[PDB]
Amino acid sequence: KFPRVKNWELGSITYDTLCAQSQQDGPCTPRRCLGSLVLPRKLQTRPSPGPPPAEQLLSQARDFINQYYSSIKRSGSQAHEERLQEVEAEVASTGTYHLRESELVFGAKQAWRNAPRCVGRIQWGKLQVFDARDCSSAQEMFTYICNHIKYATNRGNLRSAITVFPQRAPGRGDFRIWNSQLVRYAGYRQQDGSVRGDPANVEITELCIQHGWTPGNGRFDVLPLLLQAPDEAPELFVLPPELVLEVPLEHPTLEWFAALGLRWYALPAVSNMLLEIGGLEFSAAPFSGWYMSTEIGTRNLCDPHRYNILEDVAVCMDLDTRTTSSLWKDKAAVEINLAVLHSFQLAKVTIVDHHAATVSFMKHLDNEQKARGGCPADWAWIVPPISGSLTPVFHQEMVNYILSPAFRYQPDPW
Amino acid sequence: GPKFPRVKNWELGSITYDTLCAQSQQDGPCTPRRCLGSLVLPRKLQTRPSPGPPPAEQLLSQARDFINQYYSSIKRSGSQAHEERLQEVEAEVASTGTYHLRESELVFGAKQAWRNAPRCVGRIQWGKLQVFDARDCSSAQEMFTYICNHIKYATNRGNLRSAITVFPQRAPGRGDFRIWNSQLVRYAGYRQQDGSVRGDPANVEITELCIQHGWTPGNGRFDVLPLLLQAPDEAPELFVLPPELVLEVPLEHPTLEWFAALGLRWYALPAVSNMLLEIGGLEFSAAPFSGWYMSTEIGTRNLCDPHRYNILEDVAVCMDLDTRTTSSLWKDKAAVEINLAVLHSFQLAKVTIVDHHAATVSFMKHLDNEQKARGGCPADWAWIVPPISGSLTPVFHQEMVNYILSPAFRYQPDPW
Numbered sequence: 001k002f003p004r005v006k007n008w009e010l011g012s013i014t015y016d017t018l019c020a021q022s023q024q025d026g027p028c029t030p031r032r033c034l035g036s037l038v039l040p041r042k043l044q045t046r047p048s049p050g051p052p053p054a055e056q057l058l059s060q061a062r063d064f065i066n067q068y069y070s071s072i073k074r075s076g077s078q079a080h081e082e083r084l085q086e087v088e089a090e091v092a093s094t095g096t097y098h099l100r101e102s103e104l105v106f107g108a109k110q111a112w113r114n115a116p117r118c119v120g121r122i123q124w125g126k127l128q129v130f131d132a133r134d135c136s137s138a139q140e141m142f143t144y145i146c147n148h149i150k151y152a153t154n155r156g157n158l159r160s161a162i163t164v165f166p167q168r169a170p171g172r173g174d175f176r177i178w179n180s181q182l183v184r185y186a187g188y189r190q191q192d193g194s195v196r197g198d199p200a201n202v203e204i205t206e207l208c209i210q211h212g213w214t215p216g217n218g219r220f221d222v223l224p225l226l227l228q229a230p231d232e233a234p235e236l237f238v239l240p241p242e243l244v245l246e247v248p249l250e251h252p253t254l255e256w257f258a259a260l261g262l263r264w265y266a267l268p269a270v271s272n273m274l275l276e277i278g279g280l281e282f283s284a285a286p287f288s289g290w291y292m293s294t295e296i297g298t299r300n301l302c303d304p305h306r307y308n309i310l311e312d313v314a315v316c317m318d319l320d321t322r323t324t325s326s327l328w329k330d331k332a333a334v335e336i337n338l339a340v341l342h343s344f345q346l347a348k349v350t351i352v353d354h355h356a357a358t359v360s361f362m363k364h365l366d367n368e369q370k371a372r373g374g375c376p377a378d379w380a381w382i383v384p385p386i387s388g389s390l391t392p393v394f395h396q397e398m399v400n401y402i403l404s405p406a407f408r409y410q411p412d413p414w
Numbered sequence: 415g416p417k418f419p420r421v422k423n424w425e426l427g428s429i430t431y432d433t434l435c436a437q438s439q440q441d442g443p444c445t446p447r448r449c450l451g452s453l454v455l456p457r458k459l460q461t462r463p464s465p466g467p468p469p470a471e472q473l474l475s476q477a478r479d480f481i482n483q484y485y486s487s488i489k490r491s492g493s494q495a496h497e498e499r500l501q502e503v504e505a506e507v508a509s510t511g512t513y514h515l516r517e518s519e520l521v522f523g524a525k526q527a528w529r530n531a532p533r534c535v536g537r538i539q540w541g542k543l544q545v546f547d548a549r550d551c552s553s554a555q556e557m558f559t560y561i562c563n564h565i566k567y568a569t570n571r572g573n574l575r576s577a578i579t580v581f582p583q584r585a586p587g588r589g590d591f592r593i594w595n596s597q598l599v600r601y602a603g604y605r606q607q608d609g610s611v612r613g614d615p616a617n618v619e620i621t622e623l624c625i626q627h628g629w630t631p632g633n634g635r636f637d638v639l640p641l642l643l644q645a646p647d648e649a650p651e652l653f654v655l656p657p658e659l660v661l662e663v664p665l666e667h668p669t670l671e672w673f674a675a676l677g678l679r680w681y682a683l684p685a686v687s688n689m690l691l692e693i694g695g696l697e698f699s700a701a702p703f704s705g706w707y708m709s710t711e712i713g714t715r716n717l718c719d720p721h722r723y724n725i726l727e728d729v730a731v732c733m734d735l736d737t738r739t740t741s742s743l744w745k746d747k748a749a750v751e752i753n754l755a756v757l758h759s760f761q762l763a764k765v766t767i768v769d770h771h772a773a774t775v776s777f778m779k780h781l782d783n784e785q786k787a788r789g790g791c792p793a794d795w796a797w798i799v800p801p802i803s804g805s806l807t808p809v810f811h812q813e814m815v816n817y818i819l820s821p822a823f824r825y826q827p828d829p830w
């Protein structure tokens with residue numbers, strides 16, 4: 001019932017009792033574990049043909065409110081049952097309800113805290129929550145997005161933020177941001193099977209063209225936003241260059257590195273996930289914080305299905321790309337992550353290396369153990385793409401579950 | 415689509431379904447409400463000792479199941495020999511309460527247990543395994559001879575060959591055949607004066623135990639330990655492996671001439687000897703197995719782990735790296751060079767070893783093979799992906815389904 005969690009580096013032991021508070025089931029069963037799966041249709045929140053049965057919405061709602069009041073410590077006062085009957089009443093009549101700006105603020109922070117795949121949750125209590133639930137057009141969403149960016153970037157001193165657009169309603173389409181991230185580089189499928197730019201962004205780069213975008217011819221062209229208001233065709237919105245803070249990549253010692261022309265944006269704002277608070281769902285709620293050096297250095301730049309530069313860098317360093325035993329790949333990677341850490345630091349833009357990050361996650365796990373009696377973590381995601389064992393998280397046993405409020409995955413609006 | 419776990423490879427975009435998992439028989443650590451897939455020893459991968467023989471129906475159910483697998487492998491399901499063997503087994507379990515495997519049945523189960531090991535990334539050679547029957551063994555001294563024969567064969571002068579030696583199974587009442595060591599070849603861990611540990615911290619408990627049973631300890635950082643073999647109901651006897659048998663590799667770097675000066679070294683033969691081999695309900699408490707090393711097991715885990723040799727900082731200082739700041743990636747720079755040293759050394763010493771890229775690239779082919787063969791392959795992602803350069807390796811991008819298939823290598827409690 002209560003999983004014994006052990007750290008093999010220190011022999012320390014803890015029992016996760018918070019997992020008992022999970023109400024949403026995962027993909028695993030006693031017969032088999034599916035923990036390494038990126039997304040089963042279970043953790044997904046697909047569209048629907050009818051409204052969520054009241055009985056359920058009411059219970060998830062009641063729970064959230066019970067959580068919120070326990071947080072501000074007024075758990076039990078008249079204001080609690082005043083808010084409980086207010087929801088019970090609104091639900092019984094409209095079939096739904098709405099959240100107060102304070103409850104939404106507590107909800108978004110708790111969704112982050114509950115995000116199993118987030119290694120930066122040490123900073124969960126520090127989130128700027130922009131209420132954009134008064135949006136009605138794609139043009140309004142754009143304005144709301146441009147403010148989110150301008151603020152989050154803050155000239156380089158990045159700061160966590162989230163803009164929450166209008167919730168989903170059983171009687172209409174969804175407010176959606178088509179791009180997976182507010183800032184992404186374009187991926188142009190060339191003549192043969194080749195790809196100019198980011199291979200992960202080919203599909204979206206095609207859709208923008210479909211909606212009249214005039215495409216560039218570079219590996220680092222920033223994509224325009226495709227914002228969609230309920231039941232309306234999406235709209236193309238080119239982002240203001242000055243808003244988009246980018247960082248030219250250079251190496252502290254390898255002078256020729258700079259000559260590669262590599263660069264990466266400063267803001268990691270995820271815009272395709274769904275935020276769920278109290279049973280209500282927000283199909284558009286872009287959030288952002290700052291980058292961990294590996295997200296760019298290893299994955300975005302070194303993944304074989306991404307920029308894939310390992311070899312280019314390797315031959316520049318003059319490594320033996322003949323056999324895998326010379327470790328040219330491992331070597332080239334470290335230098336790339338080094339170039340990233342050097343560059344962002346030189347450009348006075350916030351980043352956190354994987355050692356610093358995982359170290360902070362260890363303290364967070366501790367704080368959470370004392371706070372809630374456990375902490376949901378996804379080992380495969382928490383452990384960095386390189387130097388896994390060189391970091392403390394690798395040696396830490398973790399328990400994974402679904403706690404609400406939560407950031408869920410959701411279908412693409414096309 | 416198909417009502418089976420859909421598996422995707424994010425690098426290639428290819429999808430496969432796992433039908434094989436349908437054949438599993440034992441529950442795991444996970445439940446729908448929580449994934450305990452990152453635990454090393456959940457009480458679900460362990461098989462506790464038995465103060466009583468397995469209930470004749472359950473033991474028989476596994477037996478029947480194993481026999482069927484055997485016949486399916488030789489392509490004689492439903493045949494006269496198949497049905498006869500089944501009767502032979504339930505007949506034997508009937509009068510004695512247990513049964514015995516046939517020579518070929520054991521070779522099959524043993525290779526099947528390897529094939530079914532979720533945490534092994536070297537399963538591509540599962541078919542090529544030398545099974546040394548040692549079910550005739552009756553004494554601790556005979557165990558030593560067997561193990562020595564094993565090390566000799568498997569070491570084959572740095573041209574390692576996969577092998578396992580199966581000692582007598584667990585009989586009701588009669589004590590078990592146990593090798594107290596975790597591996598045949600293991601360095602000693604001396605609990606120091608200040609509190610530290612000279613040698614290998616992992617082996618402190620066993621090193622303390624060897625001393626209690628009469629071992630005369632040295633005081634080195636790389637002292638091979640003596641075997642503490644135990645025959646049924648008898649006390650464990652100390653046995654010292656002769657230096658000639660224990661092949662070792664002195665570590666040196668291909669460019670950093672000073673690395674050699676570090677005096678670091680590792681043994682060529684990786685021989686796990688504390689795991690229980692389960693086949694058809696029959697338990698083999700002693701059955702050491704070995705193959706060859708994957709470079710990261712030594713260069714990253716054995717040498718760099720904080721709770722192991724922890725030589726990361728030392729090498730960093732020698733490379734003249736700023737170990738004051740995290741952002742310098744000094745841990746990353748040293749570890750790469752240490753792993754390169756391990757690779758280089760074993761190559762120079764003409765001892766068999768495989769790097770994490772090649773090892774991993776070969777596990778992908780094994781996966782494709784096992785897809786076409788059984789409709790899946792139970793893999794433990796956490797253990798399959800190397801402790802370094804994870805995403806530079808293709809298995810990182812491969813979703814994996816993990817489940818328990820019998821025969822299998824399972825953990826068991828320590829003899830003491």
Ligand code: HEM
Pocket residue numbers: 108112115117118119120121123127160161162287288289290291292295352381407
């Ligand atoms: C404060 C700085 C932050 C850092 C350094 C950080 C870092 C990370 C990293 C390394 C990942 C994995 C990303 C990947 O490999 O795709 C991640 C995932 C995630 N983070 Fe954070 N995070 C931070 C802020 C935020 C904020 C502000 C939120 C939400 C309000 C958040 C929510 C999440 C969620 C839900 C995921 C899962 C993403 C997915 O499933 O694709 N993070 N974070």
Ligand code: HEM
Pocket residue numbers: 524528531533534535536537539543576577578703704705706707708711768773823
């Ligand atoms: C042929 C060469 C082989 C290679 C390269 C290989 C490689 C590996 C690696 C890298 C591990 C991880 C061990 C750790 O990090 O603790 C592993 C685990 C394992 N291997 Fe293999 N293996 C090989 C041969 C064998 C053989 C011959 C057997 C058995 C007949 C076997 C059975 C297993 C099992 C059961 C584990 C589980 C380890 C544990 O749970 O502690 N392997 N192998």
Ligand SMILES: C[C@H](O)[C@H](O)[C@H]1CNc2nc(N)[nH]c(=O)c2N1
Pocket residue numbers: 036037038380381382424810811812813814
């Ligand atoms: C298949 C596997 O789960 C997948 O490649 C995961 C592994 N761990 C990860 N971890 C993080 N942080 N991000 C990812 O994209 C991945 N991909």
Ligand SMILES: C[C@H](O)[C@H](O)[C@H]1CNc2nc(N)[nH]c(=O)c2N1
Pocket residue numbers: 008394395396397398452453454796797798
């Ligand atoms: C806690 C976590 O399961 C543990 O540290 C695992 C991670 N992956 C591993 N992978 C391998 N190959 N070997 C190990 O010992 C581990 N340890």
Ligand SMILES: NC(=[NH2+])NCCC[C@H](N)C(=O)O
Pocket residue numbers: 181268270288289290291292295296299300
């Ligand atoms: N720091 C974050 N919260 N990042 C969210 C995911 C960003 C994504 N991994 C990228 O490389 O763009």
Ligand SMILES: NC(=[NH2+])NCCC[C@H](N)C(=O)O
Pocket residue numbers: 597684685686704705706707708711712716
């Ligand atoms: N290749 C193997 N059979 N490895 C088994 C585990 C060995 C262990 N990781 C070691 O380095 O000693």
Ligand SMILES: [Zn+2]
Pocket residue numbers: 028032033034035444448449450451
């Ligand atoms: Zn699981």
